């Protein structure tokens, strides 16, 4: 219900059956690997609701 | 016809070889013809593995592994892509 903000550092690739998901690496200052819906750029900011979780590599 | 020199298995200087049973479909296959795979796996993945470390006594814990030694028949093996169909010249490439 409360947000946490992270900074995107680079896009890695696109996942999903129809290619509608984006694989990124983000820093809050630990590093995490997250999976994003919608157009993104390096330097964007994401509001993460669940903190301790990741996505598998591609 | 006669598409393989060894006939699809490795038997020489013998009459009969006892069979085993497929790990996936239960079929009977002679031992010298099944494909053998020996897998060393982990109990849990790397994320749930470090949750067990910090909930543990002994302050230095090593999770045990698993040893399986699965065996398969030709049909139940190439449908799961442990083994693929190759070209005529590549069929001879071992190890």
């Amino acid at each position: 219900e409360k947000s946490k903000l992270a900074k995107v550092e680079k896009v890695l690739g696109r996942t999903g059956s129809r290619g509608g998901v984006i694989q990124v690496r983000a820093q809050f200052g630990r590093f995490l690997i997250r999976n994003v819906k919608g157009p993104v750029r390096e330097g964007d900011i994401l509001a993460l609701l669940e903190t301790e979780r990741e996505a598998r590599r591609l | 016809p006669k598409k393989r020199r060894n006939g699809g298995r490795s038997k020489h200087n013998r009459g009969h070889v006892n069979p085993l049973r497929c790990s996936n479909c239960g079929r009977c296959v002679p031992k010298d013809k099944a494909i053998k795979r020996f897998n060393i796996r982990n109990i849990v993945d790397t994320s749930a593995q470090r949750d067990i470390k910090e909930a543990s006594v002994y302050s230095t814990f090593q999770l045990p592994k698993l040893y399986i030694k699965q065996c398969y028949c030709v049909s139940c093996a190439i449908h799961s892509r442990f083994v693929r169909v190759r070209s005529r010249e590549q069929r001879r490439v071992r190890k």
Binding site: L5, S17, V21, K37, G38, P39, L46 | -
Partner: protein, 189 residues
């Protein structure tokens, strides 16, 4: 010294979110007297983020076939709506519309991923540009469907939708749709 509609300033308005700041534009080139600019905003990937925020709103009121291309009518509908928002709950009408944009979009969703051949409805995160697009779209449809076959005019419904959205009350079409998306996403991951 430039006002919107010659009445409202946007020289003291802030975002106060720090995530949508770079995505919605009230700044040097976006300061216009009237929301009619014949710009070319869909030629690159992100030039949509430089269009003035109020012009994006008027671009969405011309929907359902019967009203395609009627840009001047949409400018009038929004202009009178901003007047009502000022008359009751006396504040800067554009500041209220900024608050609605920041609260009307979901922060996460769910999508089908076949990672291991098995497909789940595993959840994902939403990008700031996607959040802004959703907020504008959800507000307009709520006002549009509220006024069909009703006494209240299109401009009165729009003003009531914007105030309720920025107040987090669950009487707006936007907030209850946002919560329905996030409830499913929470359930799935």
């Amino acid at each position: 010294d430039i006002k919107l509609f010659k009445k409202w300033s946007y020289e003291e308005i802030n975002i106060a979110d720090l995530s949508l700041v770079d995505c919605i534009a009230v700044s040097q080139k976006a300061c216009v007297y009237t929301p009619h600019t014949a710009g070319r905003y869909q030629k690159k990937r992100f030039r949509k983020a430089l269009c003035p925020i109020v012009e994006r709103l008027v671009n969405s009121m011309m929907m359902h076939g019967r009203n395609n291309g009627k840009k001047l009518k949409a400018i009038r509908i929004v202009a009178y709506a901003f007047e009502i928002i000022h008359l009751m709950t006396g504040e800067n009408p554009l500041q209220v519309f900024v608050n609605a944009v920041q609260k009307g979009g979901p922060r996460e969703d769910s999508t089908r991923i076949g990672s291991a051949g098995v497909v789940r409805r595993q959840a994902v995160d939403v990008s700031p540009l996607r959040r802004v697009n959703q907020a504008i779209y959800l507000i307009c449809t709520g006002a549009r469907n509220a006024a069909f076959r009703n006494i209240k005019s299109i401009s009165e419904c729009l003003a009531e939708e914007i105030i309720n959205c920025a107040n987090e009350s669950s009487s707006s079409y936007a907030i209850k749709k946002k919560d329905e998306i996030e409830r499913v996403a929470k359930a799935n991951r």
